[PDB]
Amino acid sequence: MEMEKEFEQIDKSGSWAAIYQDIRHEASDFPSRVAKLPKNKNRNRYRDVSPFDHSRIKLHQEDNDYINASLIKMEEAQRSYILTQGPLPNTVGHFWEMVWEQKSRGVVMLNRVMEKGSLKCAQYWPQKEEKEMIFEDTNLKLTLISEDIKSYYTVRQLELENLTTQETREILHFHYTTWPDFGVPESPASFLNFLFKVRESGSLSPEHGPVVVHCSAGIGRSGTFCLADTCLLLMDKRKDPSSVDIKKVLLEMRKFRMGLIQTADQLRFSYLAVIEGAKFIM
Template structure:
């Protein structure tokens, strides 16, 4: 498979001419011409179920709930037929819709949820916490209006994303399912990840879990509005599937995005997200090329060792036919790396392209490198619109690190990084390491408590705002009637007095 391909040529041309904004506007204009109706979304009883007034689900592709007090939820089923992919894209649940969200998970037989935003971003509520805050049966979340319960059972911390296991139980039948939630915590709103490498590693984990396969219910993908970051994730995944099936020159990114926009409005919200999609697709295709070359090398080595290519047996990665090896399409696009990841290089502050809140003219991106590296990932509030594509150096990491973990932290926490010679030194410094570990634990606990306090405060303010809104609505009609009667009475009195 050649790396000189149509999509990379298109990327380089767009980059050299700085035409990303123009391409994005053409896609936006074309999709607006093909727009469908959103009648259900604007009904009075459904308006309060939408997070944003200008993001509504199309009627023809909206997900219809089968039980409960309403059949409406702001979600669409996206189909990419050639890739045999289906996704449900939805908004971040609200306090009055999170039970509808879980009902959709149950009815659609979804295996995994892909969450691409934080609960709070730039001090704004972006998503209601729709899962229990603590693990254990005593903290189970009861959804009485839809007859479901949610229990938080397991957590895996992968530095820049989290994997949670949530047990969803139908109260009537007693049946339950374990739902995986892949939570990407370092993707800023209206922005892009710091590197394609980190994003592709995350996508690989979702794929390896079987969450995107056609024999399970569609994965539910959401950010805050369910169109920008969510659209980027689905576009990259679908394009890489098509490349695996039909070859590197088989895709037209613009046409695939236009096709997806027929199911849900506004997918991919900025030229930067569109540009990052191209980067991730090209980088993913190169990884696939390297994997295929490795398979060919393995096949040649086996032929040389065995002396007879026809005697090769089928293995997990490839299917042998005579003297050749064909890639099994059902295998993962990347093998899981059990080794510790290399540390990321320092952040390049000089790459910021937004200053004082004003958008600076776009500068051409660097060429897509053979490998890229993630940088300085953390859970704190560093997501902003100043994120720009990163100029990479060094080898491609499989899983980037966290700013909370230094090199010494990785060595002391990861048994795979220890050597026999380091045992005596570690033993002599055990007291100091234990002390530093306790300090880190306390800092993490303080940050967690601070975040929980913020969430509680946001919930309280949200409930207060909802109560005030309901009060205003309840007073609106009586005030209108009273004002009309007063105005009419005054007019009658004036006419009577004048005559």
């Protein structure tokens, strides 16, 4: 079926939970043996969220190459993403090592450091220009260059230096600051405006490594971001845009990381975002 009328049909029939459970039942199951090794217990934020072996990002380090991060490679859309958990106190150096080694330009953050009175991720970037951060375990230096605070999101320019080679690179940090502590946004308008700002920066383009995107576990809000982006790109590329099937795209992405889209409300919000976004594209 088309999207906007399939949407109204699920609303009127109140069957979002059944649609979402079907997706959970059909989703791929692949091994995640490296994630479950005992030496990696303190590298995982949640015991039930792990990267598959076949798609995990490997750190270029012979001691322990493990990080909780996955490469999502969308063949028809010609778009790749790295989805990862919010960094832990003991994995902030690994996080920036990954950014460096994978040649990413942009980092997309969809959570606040504290939500619901608990820490959802480490303070992994510097908050003042004159107070830079040094990660001694991976030999990197990170400096805040500029910060632009808007009503729904903040953009930061960061400088990452490989201290071993003295090479430097500019990284763009896109921070969506207004996702509610519970549920999903009432309108997709600010999320779509945010998605277009990331696009306009060049961070998603093939001339760079894959964008790094995260929330707390790296599957819910993060899944919503890449699902909406890929579906809108396919609607632009194809002769028949009504042939884009959001459920089929989500199952394809779940071949590369488990659990993408965590609730039936997030599924409904993803439909809403693609529907409204398709009108603005033209």
